[PDB]
Amino acid sequence: EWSSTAITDRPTVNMLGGYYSQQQFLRNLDVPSVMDEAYKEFVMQLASWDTRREFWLQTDYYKQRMVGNSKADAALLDEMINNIQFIPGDFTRAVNDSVKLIAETAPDANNLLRQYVAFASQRAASHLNDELKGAWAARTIQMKAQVKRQEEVAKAIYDRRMNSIEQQARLENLQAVGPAFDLDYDQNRAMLNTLNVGPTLDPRFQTYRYLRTPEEPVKRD
Amino acid sequence: EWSSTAITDRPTVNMLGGYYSQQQFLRNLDVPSVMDEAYKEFVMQLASWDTRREFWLQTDYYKQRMVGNSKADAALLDEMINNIQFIPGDFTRAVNDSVKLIAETAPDANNLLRQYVAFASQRAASHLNDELKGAWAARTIQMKAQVKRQEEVAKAIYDRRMNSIEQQARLENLQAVGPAFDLDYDQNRAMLNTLNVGPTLDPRFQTYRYLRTPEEPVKRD
Amino acid sequence: EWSSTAITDRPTVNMLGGYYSQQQFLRNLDVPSVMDEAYKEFVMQLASWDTRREFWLQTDYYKQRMVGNSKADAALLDEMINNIQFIPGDFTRAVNDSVKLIAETAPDANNLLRQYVAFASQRAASHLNDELKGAWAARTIQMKAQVKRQEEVAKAIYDRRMNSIEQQARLENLQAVGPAFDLDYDQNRAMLNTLNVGPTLDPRFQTYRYLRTPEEPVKRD
Amino acid sequence: EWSSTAITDRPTVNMLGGYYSQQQFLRNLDVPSVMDEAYKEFVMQLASWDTRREFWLQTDYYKQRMVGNSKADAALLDEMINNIQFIPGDFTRAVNDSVKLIAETAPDANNLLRQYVAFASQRAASHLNDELKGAWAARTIQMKAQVKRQEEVAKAIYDRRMNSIEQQARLENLQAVGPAFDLDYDQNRAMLNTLNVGPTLDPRFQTYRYLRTPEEPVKRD
Amino acid sequence: EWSSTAITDRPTVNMLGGYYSQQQFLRNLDVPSVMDEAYKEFVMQLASWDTRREFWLQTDYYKQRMVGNSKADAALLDEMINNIQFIPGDFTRAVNDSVKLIAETAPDANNLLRQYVAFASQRAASHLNDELKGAWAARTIQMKAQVKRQEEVAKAIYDRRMNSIEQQARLENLQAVGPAFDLDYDQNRAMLNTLNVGPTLDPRFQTYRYLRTPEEPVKRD
Amino acid sequence: EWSSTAITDRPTVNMLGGYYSQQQFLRNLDVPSVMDEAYKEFVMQLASWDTRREFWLQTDYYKQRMVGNSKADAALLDEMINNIQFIPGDFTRAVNDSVKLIAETAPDANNLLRQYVAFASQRAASHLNDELKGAWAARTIQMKAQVKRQEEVAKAIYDRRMNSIEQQARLENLQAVGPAFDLDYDQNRAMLNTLNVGPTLDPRFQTYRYLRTPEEPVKRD
Amino acid sequence: EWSSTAITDRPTVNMLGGYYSQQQFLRNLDVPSVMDEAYKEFVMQLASWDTRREFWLQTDYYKQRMVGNSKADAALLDEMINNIQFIPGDFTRAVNDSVKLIAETAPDANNLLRQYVAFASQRAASHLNDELKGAWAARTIQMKAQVKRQEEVAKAIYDRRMNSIEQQARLENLQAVGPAFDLDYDQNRAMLNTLNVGPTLDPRFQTYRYLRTPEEPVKRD
Amino acid sequence: EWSSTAITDRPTVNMLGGYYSQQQFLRNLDVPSVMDEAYKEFVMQLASWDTRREFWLQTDYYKQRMVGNSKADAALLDEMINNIQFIPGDFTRAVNDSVKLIAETAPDANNLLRQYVAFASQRAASHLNDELKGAWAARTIQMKAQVKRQEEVAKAIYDRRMNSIEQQARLENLQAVGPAFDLDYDQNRAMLNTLNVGPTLDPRFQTYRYLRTPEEPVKRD
């Protein structure tokens, strides 16, 4: 009976909080914008069948209209799932991504659309933190193993030199100074320290901006 | 009934005021033109539903047609949002971006359009400033982390040569010199100073330029 | 008479688990993403005729409809193979990949589509692990021959130098220290170490994610 | 009744006068020709609605046709505005940029078109001069901050070596010599000087050339 | 009257057995993956008129169908060749490669399709092994020539210096040490040592995989 | 009545004579061939309305056909301008550029066409000469400023090293000699000489070559 | 009335025998696959009128069909030329090149098509070998010139050092030793040796491979 | 009445004789193959009107059909020109470059078409020799200017050294030796020697190869 509409675009840097500096951090360890990737996920949460379904199942609107029949509630549920509609933008055309939500009332249409949007976005944020955490842990690990191989290189060299000095002061010097470590290793060690701190996983952050905010439609559908 | 029309294209370097010099500074650290990014944001602002809505809300022209009955005014506001009409250009056929505003008179259509444009431009310039501000902060911490780590490396090398020396004037010597710092530390450092002073935020700059300024229409639509 | 529908997309890093960092370990030695290459395998498994045959064959659904007549159990096997319909996506259209499954009941259609999905993800994971194994063994052998050759180079130079010294401390010193080894040899030795350890076989990992999870269909086909 | 036509192309290096070598000097420090940029600007001027309006308003031809009726005078203005027409070349098929102007006699069409073109050239020239000026300000400021940072690096290094020396000749050396500046600093200093001098602005330069100069038509439109 | 259908793709590293790391070895000496090139050969074998013809001719199914009439036998042969139909994928639409085999019964269609597939693969492997031998011998030859040139450069340098010292320890020393070989030479030399061993030619390695194994069709064509 | 035709392509280096070497000389400093570009201007001169007009005006044919009235002679002139038609080629179909001329007699059409061509090459040549001139002058200014600075740098350095020397043989050394000058300085200097000498002006050179020379028509249009 | 058919593709590396390594040897000096180029030569040979003409001219089939009238035999020869038909493949649609030969019998059509293929391949091979011998010869001249010039550079430097040092051991040494030569001269000398040895021409090699071998057609045309 | 036909392609490396190795040399001096460029010129000559005209005027076939009347003979000449038709190949369609010639008898059509292609080959050859030769002249003049500038650099540095040294072994030393010249100067010296030698320009070399040779037509058109 009534529908609201939203039009969206990619989040601002500020909207990603620590995730941004953390994702860039991880990006700038491996060598399309971070915000681009984020919005990619938002669009994906926003479009999901699972997401709409869970939303309605979680919605009181749906619940007060429940009659206690599994088939009817699932038809109604499916219908409500169907009452949320995403249209991908055409950026060749300045048509942006946009979403509409139908309910039996205008206030229901607006508020429900708002709640749905916040819902999809939370799922997106949560998933990007899983991604981040899983990128950080791994980076901490590659460095630990790398640093470790480096320690093994210095150790083989050290032993060889030892054995060459053997066959007298510099034998004692080498013996007490230990293996020789290049700069790369210590750098790897301090990065390892920061990595070992482990990521700040802020679940809050936002994953989209509005170009058109849902409003109470001024007329019926 | 009475409509006015404007046509725009990307702003120039000077047009961006003190924003231009600022963005280039950040681009030259992590390594589409700035003005281009800016015009995209301008277009983006221009076409938005929300922007039109808030304009009329803040516009005396709109405020003056409200009757104090919430539904009729919301319908009227809806009608004015639809009375501002965006027509994206196409650059295969050398068509630029254009915009129309319908109002109840020719003067209103002109003044309102000039105000609507100025309003949009000022809003775009604000969005650009926000992105800058946030990227700069992410950058100050990234390099701060970079420097910190650089200091941990320096101390590990320090404790290591002291230990290597203990086992004499060079002892006390090293004990007095402290960690050895390379050119890049001092450079990053002074850059860190300039990063710390913080960017300058010009709210002045225009984020577009007129190829066609609004004028009073000669006749009605 | 009842069909369930599901929709999948490429996995993410955490989803890929221990597999990711192993694949990346091997790409930085031979010098499109890894989860893209995982998902491509997922889709391919999803479509397979062989997979449908063996799935139904290991399935109680089919078995109870087995009459113990081989031609009819096979024809039923085929029909039920044909009761599974895959529909590829198109990103020009921004349509994601999607699968339908027909069965005699709704709960069966739902549960069977989910099971078939899990079966497919698991077959895909298994395959990816096999590739990793055999490439690891290859690279390991390659490097093994490279280190061997490095040792033969050092021994020819050593033979040359001992002859050149023959023709007296330097003699005994060379005679007792053995051939000299460069940093590349030792680093290669440590990588041979970590390679020789061999890869970690994780069979636990997912190779798709749901955008739409199978649910009980609400009406017949 | 009567109409003139012109065809343009980018100006010569010579027509840009003092503007040309200055735009090139700013080009070689931020590491599509200038006459092209100028022509693009020219053509911009040539194409602008505002430029045509301001032209007629600034044209005696228009001023003289005003009747002191707002409606009639604005309508007339609009009409004359509409009497200047630009066609972008389609350089794929050797059609060059061209402009046509309609008036009530042949001499008027000719004279007004030549004036409008010189006017456009002059505005283009004026504008291109503005672009230049603002870029040269961004740049002077940037060398100052760069040189000052350099000064402060050299100062940190100086200060550091001074402390280190204290715990005696080269000490007093250091004392009296000051920070140690590289060839880079001095180059930047002299440059800083040249930067400090400021730009030349001849607004007289021509910003186009003619491929077809306007002439008096030999028959009615 | 009956057909079996098989569906195929590129072989694995493991299937290529000894073939794979040797093809990669030659690649890391010269400068589309190996398994792709191998597959290109399989596909090549599968589609061939000659291969189908040779298949049927070496097939009992055919021989037993000879009536000893040259013209009926050649035409039968041609038919049977025509009873193996190969269809190329197009990957725009997720359409994979497929082979169908028509025979007079379901098990014949199945067995013969499996058999034809095996035949194409063996021919492909025999051939791929052929090519490998005539790439191994060539790169071997190239490296002897490079090493030989290195010896002759070395010897001409040696001769030059000889002449020059004559005109007294270093004369004898040099006459006793011989030409001075660089790491380049010695590396090329050990590479010669391995290169001279020659490739392992296992003809049994497999050159394709099944996405659909032929099965006894359950209904006629 | 009668008409002639000509067919052209880019000239050859020899045809550019002394001009070629000069344009390539400038090109090898600033960091499409030159005969292509010469030809570009040539074609522009060729198609230009202005060029056709001035051609007729300097011709005896027209003069002898003038009737002594400006309007009638302008109309005649106009008739004759429209009597020269340029047609660009299309190299997709391997079509070259081509030109036609109409006149009252055959010999006039031939002679006039040939004279127009030599005239155009001459204008193109004087124009290309002009471009070359302007550009030369500007580049000379640039290196004069670059050497000025190398000296100010060397001078600042000189001043600093002398002041540093002050607080005794080398003091007199530096005080007599001068600022130190790098190879770059002297090379810049020698080049500055050659720059200073200025360009050889071929007003001769050919700016096109013929694929088809004009001849006398055998028949009318 | 009878026709045979064949289908071909590019040859393999060992099919080209010695040719391939030699062409690869040249390309490595002056720093589209070889097989590609050999094949494209093959295709030019196969389609060629001249080639067909000479093949029939050299055939007993034709010779036994001559009647000794030059008009009639030229007409027959012409007829026999138009009886070999080449059909270009198409990459867009995976069509391969294919060839048909018509004769008065099926056996003739077979043998003759096989003989034509071997003849054409031998002609292509001849051309490729020709191109090779000429590129190698030019390559050879080039390097000799390079060695000569290097010796003149060394002679100029020789003369210069002699005159310089006069104005006594070193004088006499310099006199005995001759000009000085860097490694590049000697590498050039040995390779010049290998260029001088000249290329080996394999005339047996194959310049194509069969996908479909001609067979005796089964029925008349 | 009767017509002959030819088809061509790029000349072999060989057919360019001394020209080929000379074009590569310039190609290697400044930084589409040479044979391609030669063919490009040949094809250009082949299609030229001028070439055909020059051809027929030089033919007895024409002179014998002249009646000593300028109109009939020019018209006949124009007809004679129109009886040779060239069609550029579409290589996408495996269609190569081809030419046809119409005449009154079959032997004439044959013989005349032959003489004509050779005529075009020789014109292309002479032209290519002019391009080469003038490119050589340009290059030689530039080398002379480069060497003199280097000499003036060593001279400036020399006077600097003479003065510096005067203000005593190294004085008479420096005096007696002269300006200091690096290896690049000497390399440039020998190459100027060989540049001064000048190119070899053989005009007999061929500039095309045939794919179809003209023959006596066997029937009228």
SS3 for D174-202, per residue? HHHHCCCCCHHHHHHHHHHHHHHHCCCCC
Q: Which residues 53-112 on chain H approach chain F with CB closer than 8 angstroms?
A: 53, 71, 74-75, 78, 88
Residue B171 is classified by DSSP as H
Overall size of chain G counted in residues: 221
Reference F47, options D11, D94, D217, D214; nearest CA is: D94
Q: Give burial (CB, 10 Å; 0-12/13-18/19+) of C171.
A: exposed
Residues of B in contact with A186 (CB under 8 A): 152-153, 156-157
Q: Which residues is F7 bridged to in the sheet?
A: F98, F212
Name the minimum distance, in Å, from the CA of B149 to any CA of chain A: 6
CB pair distance less than 8 Å for G213 and E49: yes
Q: Are G102 and G117 in contact (CB under 8 A)?
A: no
The CB density around residue F121, as the number of other CB atoms within 10 Å, is 22
Q: Are G207 and G88 in contact (CB under 8 A)?
A: no
**What sign results for the dihedral spanned by CA atoms G192, G193, G194, G199?**
positive
Instruction: Map out the domains of chain F with their CATH numbers.
Output: 2-142+202-212 (3.30.1890.10)
CA distances from F212 to C179, F6, H53 (A): 77, 6, 10
Cα nearest neighbour of E186 on chain C: C153
Is residue B210 within a helix (H) or strand (E), and if so which, with residue range? Answer: strand B209-212
Q: Which residues is D171 bridged to in the sheet?
A: none
Residues of G in contact with E163 (CB under 8 A): 177
- What would the two tokens of residue G201 be? 């021409």
Annotate E77-140 with three-state secondary structure. HHHHHHCEEEECCEHHHCECEEEEEEECCHHHHHHHHHHHHHHHHHHHHHHHHHHHHHHHHHHH
The B209-212 sheet, strands edge to edge: B84-87, B97-103, B2-9, B209-212
Among G212, G216, G219, G220, which would you mutate to test the E interface (most chain E Cβ atoms within 10 Å of its Cβ)? G212
- Identity of the amino acid at E59: T
Reference G37, options G129, G114, G118; nearest CA is: G129
Reference A112, options A209, A216, A218, A219; nearest CA is: A216
- What would the two tokens of residue C71 be? 């031609």
The CB density around residue H90, as the number of other CB atoms within 10 Å, is 11
Q: Are E162 and E172 in contact (CB under 8 A)?
A: no
Question: What is the spatial distance between Cα H125 and Cα B43, in angstroms, rounded to a whole number?
Answer: 60
CB pair distance less than 8 Å for B20 and D138: yes
Q: Which residues 26-55 on chain F approach chain D with CB closer than 8 angstroms?
A: 43-44, 47-50, 53
Reference E49, options G144, H52, G211; nearest CA is: G211
E strands in chain C: 2-9, 84-87, 98-103, 209-212
Q: Are E218 and E49 in contact (CB under 8 A)?
A: no
Question: What is the spatial distance between Cα C103 and Cα B215, in angstroms, rounded to a whole number?
Answer: 68
Query: Considering CB atoms only, which of G50, G88, G145 is closest to H212?
Result: G50
Q: Which residues is G90 bridged to in the sheet?
A: G95
Is residue C114 within a helix (H) or strand (E), and if so which, with residue range? Answer: helix C106-166
Question: What is the spatial distance between Cα C33 and Cα A88, in angstroms, rounded to a whole number?
Answer: 24
The CB density around residue G23, as the number of other CB atoms within 10 Å, is 22
Cα nearest neighbour of G146 on chain H: H191
Among A14, A158, A185, A200, which would you mutate to test the B interface (most chain B Cβ atoms within 10 Å of its Cβ)? A14
Question: What is the spatial distance between Cα F191 and Cα D10, in angstroms, rounded to a whole number?
Answer: 31
Q: Are H77 and H49 in contact (CB under 8 A)?
A: no
CA distances from H107 to C12, D6, D10, G66, G69 (A): 78, 58, 58, 21, 16
Residue F88 is classified by DSSP as -
Helix, strand, or coil here: G8?
Answer: strand
Residues 6 or more apart whose CB falls under 8 angstroms from that of G51 comprise G45, G119, G120, G123
Helix, strand, or coil here: D210?
Answer: strand
How far is C-alpha G65 from the geometric centre of its chain's CA atoms?
Answer: 34
Show the DSSP H helices in B59-182 as ranges. 60-63, 70-81, 106-166, 169-177
Cα nearest neighbour of G185 on chain E: E153
Q: Which residue has the tokens 């690869």?
A: G24
CB pair distance less than 8 Å for A12 and B134: yes
Reference C38, options C59, C17, C52; nearest CA is: C17
Q: Do chains F and D touch (3 or more CB pairs under 8 A)?
A: yes
Question: What is the spatial distance between Cα G40 and Cα G19, in angstroms, rounded to a whole number?
Answer: 15
- Identity of the amino acid at D192: L
Name the minimum distance, in Å, from the CA of E191 to any CA of chain C: 7
Q: Which residue has the tokens 């189908």?
A: E52
Question: What is the spatial distance between Cα A13 and Cα A36, in angstroms, rounded to a whole number?
Answer: 10
Is residue D41 within a helix (H) or strand (E), and if so which, with residue range? Answer: helix D34-47
Q: Are D59 and D53 in contact (CB under 8 A)?
A: no
| DSSP string across chain H | -EEEEEEEEPPPTGGGTHHHHHHHHHHHHH---HHHHHHHHHHHHHH-HHHHHHHHHT-HHHHTT--S-HHHHHHHHHHHHHTEEEE---GGGTPPEEEEEEESSHHHHHHHHHHHHHHHHHHHHHHHHHHHHHHHHHHHHHHHHHHHHHHHHHHHHHHHHHHHHH--HHHHHHHHH-S---HHHHHHHHHHHHHHH-----TTS---EEEE-----SSB-
Q: Are H203 and H17 in contact (CB under 8 A)?
A: no
Question: What is the spatial distance between Cα F173 and Cα F159, in angstroms, rounded to a whole number?
Answer: 14
- What are the phi and psi torsion angles at F143 (to 5°)? -75, -35
Residues 6 or more apart whose CB falls under 8 angstroms from that of G76 comprise G62, G65, G66, G67
Residues 6 or more apart whose CB falls under 8 angstroms from that of C90 comprise none
Helix, strand, or coil here: D217?
Answer: coil
Q: Are A113 and A102 in contact (CB under 8 A)?
A: no
Contacts by A16-22, CB closer than 8 A, 24 or more apart: A16/A205, A17/A202, A17/A204, A17/A205, A18/A200, A18/A202, A19/A128, A19/A129, A19/A132, A19/A202, A19/A205, A20/B134, A20/B138, A21/B138, A21/B141, A21/B142, A22/A132, A22/A136, A22/A199, A22/A200
Exposure of H172 in the CB half-sphere (CA atoms within 13 A): 5
**What sign results for the dihedral spanned by CA atoms B132, B136, B142, B146?**
positive
Is residue E7 within a helix (H) or strand (E), and if so which, with residue range? Answer: strand E2-9
Query: Considering CB atoms only, which of B187, B212, B218 is closest to D78?
Result: B218
Cα nearest neighbour of A133 on chain C: C14
- What would the two tokens of residue B115 be? 């105000």
Overall size of chain F counted in residues: 221
| DSSP string across A105-147 | SHHHHHHHHHHHHHHHHHHHHHHHHHHHHHHHHHHHHHHHHHH
**Angle in degrees, 0-180, between the axes of helices E70-82 and E49-57, rounded to the nearest 10:** 120
Question: What is the spatial distance between Cα E5 and Cα E10, in angstroms, rounded to a whole number?
Answer: 18
Question: What is the spatial distance between Cα C53 and Cα C56, in angstroms, rounded to a whole number?
Answer: 5
Question: What is the spatial distance between Cα C211 and Cα G23, in angstroms, rounded to a whole number?
Answer: 55
CB pair distance less than 8 Å for H130 and F12: yes
Question: What is the spatial distance between Cα F178 and Cα F167, in angstroms, rounded to a whole number?
Answer: 19
Name the minimum distance, in Å, from the CA of H77 to any CA of chain G: 30
The F84-87 sheet, strands edge to edge: F84-87, F98-103, F2-9, F209-212
Name the minimum distance, in Å, from the CA of D209 to any CA of chain B: 22
CA distances from D25 to A91, B22, B23, H174 (A): 37, 21, 21, 41
Residues 6 or more apart whose CB falls under 8 angstroms from that of C134 comprise E12, E13, E14, E20
E strands in chain A: 2-9, 84-87, 97-103, 209-212
Residues of E in contact with G186 (CB under 8 A): 153, 156-157
Question: What is the spatial distance between Cα F6 and Cα F217, in angstroms, rounded to a whole number?
Answer: 12
B166 and chain A in contact, CB less than 8 A? no
- What would the two tokens of residue E186 be? 């010695």
Cα nearest neighbour of H147 on chain F: F190
Q: Give burial (CB, 10 Å; 0-12/13-18/19+) of D117.
A: buried
What's the alpha-carbon Rg for chain B, to the nearest Å? 28
CB pair distance less than 8 Å for D186 and F157: yes
CB pair distance less than 8 Å for G215 and E47: no
Query: Considering CB atoms only, which of H50, H78, H135 is closest to F213?
Result: H50
Question: What is the spatial distance between Cα A155 and Cα A125, in angstroms, rounded to a whole number?
Answer: 45
Residues 6 or more apart whose CB falls under 8 angstroms from that of E90 comprise none
E strands in D17-176: 84-87, 97-103
Q: Are A24 and A33 in contact (CB under 8 A)?
A: no
Q: Which residues 172-211 on chain D approach chain B with CB closer than 8 angstroms?
A: none
CA distances from D154 to B187, B190, D151, D161, E179 (A): 10, 11, 5, 11, 52
Question: What is the spatial distance between Cα F19 and Cα F48, in angstroms, rounded to a whole number?
Answer: 23
- What would the two tokens of residue H20 be? 């080929």
Question: What is the spatial distance between Cα G153 and Cα G146, in angstroms, rounded to a whole number?
Answer: 11
CB pair distance less than 8 Å for G176 and E167: yes
Residues 6 or more apart whose CB falls under 8 angstroms from that of H157 comprise F183, F186, H179, H180
CB pair distance less than 8 Å for D25 and F71: no
Residue D2 is classified by DSSP as E
Residue C8 is classified by DSSP as E
Query: How close are the terminal C-alpha atoms of chain H, in Å?
Result: 5
What's the alpha-carbon Rg for chain A, to the nearest Å? 28
CB pair distance less than 8 Å for B212 and D50: yes
Query: Considering CB atoms only, which of H9, H13, H210 is closest to G134?
Result: H13
Q: Which residue has the tokens 């740049």?
A: D139
Residues of D in contact with B14 (CB under 8 A): 130-131, 133-135
Q: Give burial (CB, 10 Å; 0-12/13-18/19+) of F118.
A: exposed
CA distances from E193 to C150, E133, E186, E200, G31 (A): 12, 17, 10, 16, 28
To 10 degrees, the CA torsion angle through H92, H96, H102, H106? -130
**Angle in degrees, 0-180, between the axes of helices A183-197 and A106-166, rounded to the nearest 10:** 150
Question: What is the spatial distance between Cα B100 and Cα B95, in angstroms, rounded to a whole number?
Answer: 15
Query: How close are the terminal C-alpha atoms of chain E, in Å?
Result: 5
Query: Between F and H, how many residue pairs show a Cβ–Cβ distance under 8 A?
Result: 66
What's the alpha-carbon Rg for chain E, to the nearest Å? 28
What's the alpha-carbon Rg for chain F, to the nearest Å? 28
Is residue C190 within a helix (H) or strand (E), and if so which, with residue range? Answer: helix C183-197
CA distances from C155 to C184, C191, E177, F60, H211 (A): 16, 22, 16, 94, 60
Question: What is the spatial distance between Cα E174 and Cα F86, in angstroms, rounded to a whole number?
Answer: 79
